[model samples]
Target chain A: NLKDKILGVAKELFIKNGYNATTTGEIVKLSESSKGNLYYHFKTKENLFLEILNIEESKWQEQWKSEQIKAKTNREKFYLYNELSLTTEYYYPLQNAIIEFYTEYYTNSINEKMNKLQNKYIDAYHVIFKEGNLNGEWSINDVNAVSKIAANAVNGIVTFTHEQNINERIKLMNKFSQIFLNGLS
Target chain B: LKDKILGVAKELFINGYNATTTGEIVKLSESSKGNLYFKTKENLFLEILNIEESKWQEQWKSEQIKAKTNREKFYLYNELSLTTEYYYPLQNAIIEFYTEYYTNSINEKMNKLQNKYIDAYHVIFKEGNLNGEWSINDVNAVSKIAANAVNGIVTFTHEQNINERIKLMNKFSQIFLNGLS
Candidate 1:
C-alpha cells in the first residue's frame, strides 16, 4: 500500500507541479512516508515516473482490448486505436507534466521503457495489419517492417499533437491513419 | 577573449543552462567580467543559437540546390538534423532551456525556427500537389504528419546511434513518399 500510495502521491505532485520542479524528497514527505520506504519501492525518481506510466498503459491496454473487438473492419480498428491514444492516455491533465518529465530526465533506463511502448504498439499494429491481410483488403509484403514503421509514426503523431486540441488531434490521427491505410493514391 | 568566452559557454552549456554561470565563464576564460560578456546569459545563448542557425542556413543554401525536387530537399534537411555537426549544440541548448529555463523570447525564437523548418516541408508538399506528383486534400495536415513521424523516430529512438537513425529515417521516407500500400 505504501508503494502504491507513493506512486499516487508522486503522480499528483507531478501533475500539479511538473517533473523538473518536484523532488523525490517532496513526494516522500507529502505521502507521510519516509525516504527509505520510497527508496525501497523505487530506486530513483525516474523509477517512480516509469511505474506511473506503466500503470497508465495497463489501463489503456485493457480498454483497447475491450473496445477494439467491436470494430467493423481492420481499418476501422486501426483508426480507433490511434484515436484512443489521445483519449485514454496518461490522463489528459497529466500530459504536459509527463512529457516535461521525460524531456528533463531522459535516460537509458527510461529509454528501455519507452522502447517497450514501441514494441507494444508494433505488435498490436502488426496484428491489425495482419488481420486485414487475412480478409484480403490490402496487398503488402514485409508486414513486420510495416508494423514497426506504423508504431513509430503513431507514437510520433501523439507527441507532436501536444499543441493541438482533442478534436483537432483526433482529426489528425484519423487522417494519418487513412494515409497509412490507403497510402497516397 | 571573445573566442574564449564563446568556447567556455559551449562547454558549460553542455552541462545545462541552470548549471552554467557567467562568472565561471569569466573565470575559465581568464577574462574580467567587465569585458567578457554578452548582454546577458540569455542573450549569449540566443547568440550561439543564431550562429548555429546561420551556419545551417549557409550550408542549406549551397547544398540544398543539388536536390532538384522538394522531396529531396526535405530529406536533405533530415540528414543534416541527424548529423552532429549541425545538430549537437542546438539540441543541447534547447534541452537545457526546457529543463529549468523558460523565456517567452527564447520560446518565440525556437518556435519561429521550428515553423520555418516545418514550413519548408509544408511548401514541399504544396509544391508536390501543384506539380501533380501526388494528390492530397489537406496539405498542411499531411506536412505535419510527416514532420511528426521523423520527430517521433528521433525522440523515441535516442538509444540508437546517428547512423542507425539515418538508415531508419531514409527507410521511413522511402515508404512515406512512395506509399505503403
Candidate 2:
C-alpha cells in the first residue's frame, strides 16, 4: 500500500535526518507518493511523526506482551520486563524520540494521550507491587508510592546509564533494584 | 570569639568537616599561638561551624578574609597542583562519598529515591539510540511512552546528562524534601 511506503520512507528518513532535519517533501519524493495523498493520510508532518513513534513503540510492545504472557508472578514479570528493556538494546530512537516528544508535543493533543500511556506503564509497575504484597513476596504498605518510586528509579537508570558509562549504569541499576526491593519488602 | 571558632570550623568542615588540624587553622588565620589556643581548646580541635558561630556573632572579628583580587590568581596557580586525571577520581570519590552519605540518611532517602530514579531513567534512555548493544523489549508498549515522559523531564532539567551531573545533589535534595517527602 502507499501508506506502508510513505511510513517506511518517513520512518527511515526521520531516523537518519532526525525529526527536525527531515521534511515531508523528501518523504513524498522518496516514496514516489504525492504530498496530497500523504497529507490526506497524515494531517501534518508532526502527526505522521507521532504515528511513526506509535508504530515503532507498538512493534516493541507486541514483543513485550508475548514475553510477559510467558512469565508468571511479579518477580518474573519484572525480570522479563527488564530483560526486554536492557538486553535487546532496541529503541535507541525511541529514547531520542522520547526526549524530543516531550519538548514538541506538550501543549498538543498528544499530551493527554501521552499521560494516559504513561499512567498505564505506571500501573504495570503498580501491578507488580500489588502482586508482591498479595503473595507476601513484598511487604509494601503503600504499593502506589513505592511502585511510583521504583518506576522513577528504573526510568532514571535507563537514562543515566546512557549518558554515563554502561558498567556504572548497570551498577546503579543493580543497586537501585536492590534498594527498591528492599523498600518494597 | 565563639563565632570565629564556628566559622573557621565550618569552612574546614565543608570539605572534610573533621580531618583538618589546628595548625592549619592558625596558618590560615595568621593568628598567634596564644590567640589560637586562647578561646578554644589548647589544640585547634574545635568544630568548623563552631568557629562559624563565632565569626558571625563577632562581625568578621575572627579576621578570616578571601584573597579578593589575588584570589583568582592564587587559584590559577593552585590549579597546577593536580593533573587532569586528578579531577575525575577526586570528583568521583567525592560524589560516591556523598551519594552513600546522603542515602544513608533516613530523612533524605525518599526524596533521593525519587530524584535518583528520574536521573537514572534519563541516563539509560540516552544510550538506547547511540549504542548498538541496547535493545527494547516492548516495541510499542506504554513503557516507551512512560520512559519518554520522564526523558522530557530529565532533558528539561539539563541538556546533556554531563552538564547537570553536579546538579544532582541539589535536585535530589529539593525534590526529595519538597516534592517526594
Scored by lDDT, the top model is 1
Per residue, candidate 1 scores C-alpha lDDT tens digits across B7-89 of 67767775566557887878877887778556777778767766666676667777778778877876776666566454344
Please write out the lDDT profile of model 1 over residues A1-185, one tens digit for every residue: 88888889898898888777889889988888999988788788877788888887777677788999889888889888877775755366667566565555556767777768657657888888888888877765667767776777788787545444678878887877877677623
Q: Flag clash pairs in model 1.
A: none
User: After superposition, which runs of candidate 2 have C-alpha atoms over 4 Å from their true positions?
Assistant: A68-73, A87-91, A139-145, B1-181
Worst 10 residues of 2 chain B by lDDT: B81-90
Per-residue lDDT for A92-145 in model 2, tens only?
654544444454555547665565555555676788778877887766666665
How close is each model in CA RMSD to the real structure? Answer: 4.3, 20.5
Superposed Cα deviation of residue B51, candidate 1 (Å): 3.6
CA deviation > 4 Å runs, candidate 1: A24-26, A29-33, A67-70, A86-93, A100-110, A161-170, B1-50, B65-76, B87-111, B126-132, B135-138, B161-163, B179-181
CA shift of B173, model 2, Å: 10
lDDT of 2 by residue, B28-50 (tens): 66666676543443223222222
TM-score of each: 0.76, 0.47
Model 2: how far residue B83 lies from native, Å: 37
